[PDB]
């Protein structure tokens with residue numbers, strides 16, 4: 358079929374380089390095109406991925422020095438824009454987005470991939486508001502040949518990073534993503550980030566360890582999701598709740614949404 362390979366770039370989605378919304382000349386199918394050694398790793402990690410809650414990779418095209426990444430277009434935009442500042446969103450929406458985020462994170466960890474930059478800017482929504490984990494540019498293999506490798510590189514965004522990443526030379530990959538999912542859940546339910554970074558020098562972080570939940574953002578959050586956040590936002594990564602136990606949490610399994 359002629360012209361089926363021709364795509365028109367209609368608008369900027371992000372600007373590493375840039376991301377454009379591409380529309381097929383013949384079929385009018387919408388795709389996102391990312392124009393850019395972490396790019397070689399991004400393509401490699403993306404080629405491994407196939408899950409309903411992970412942005413689908415269609416392929417890559419190399420034209421000289423510029424790399425083109427063909428990715429699933431999510432028309433609902435970013436989860437970030439569904440969070441009303443200082444309010445959040447209705448608890449049933451947050452629970453559904455959290456279920457989908459757990460599905461995507463379980464999938465990634467199951468194949469030995471850690472995203473390392475989970476935040477609402479990297480959680481995209483399709484036409485039916487289905488959450489998709491986006492941008493594997495900071496992602497890495499933490500398990501290979503059933504052997505876990507401990508991480509040591511500083512990756513992520515300070516309000517979302519786990520405290521071990523700032524205190525320890527080495528750390529397990531999975532508790533780090535579990536923590537950032539708890540900061541995402543906090544943002545969805547309170548419309549604010551609890552601290553600039555998880556360090557004792559940070560007063561807001563010290564208050565949380567002291568269990569001062571009568572303060573913001575915690576006072577805007579119901580006791581059932583707050584009990585879950587008490588299990589996720591645990592400083593010791595070895596004592597922090599794992600995803601199998603998050604799936605057994607009372608609020609996680611609370612019927613809320615129609």
Ligand SMILES: COc1cc(-c2ccc3c(c2)Nc2ccc(CC(=O)N(C)C)cc2NC3=O)ccc1[N+](=O)[O-]
Nearest residue numbers: 370371373376389391429430431432433434435481492
């Ligand atoms: C994979 O790496 C990246 C991907 C994106 C990106 C890719 C696709 C979308 C997106 C952002 N967000 C995005 C933002 C806004 C909207 C809706 C909207 O308001 N307009 C104007 C189209 C849709 C999308 N849809 C996407 O599917 C943005 C930045 C990066 N990056 O930093 O590398």
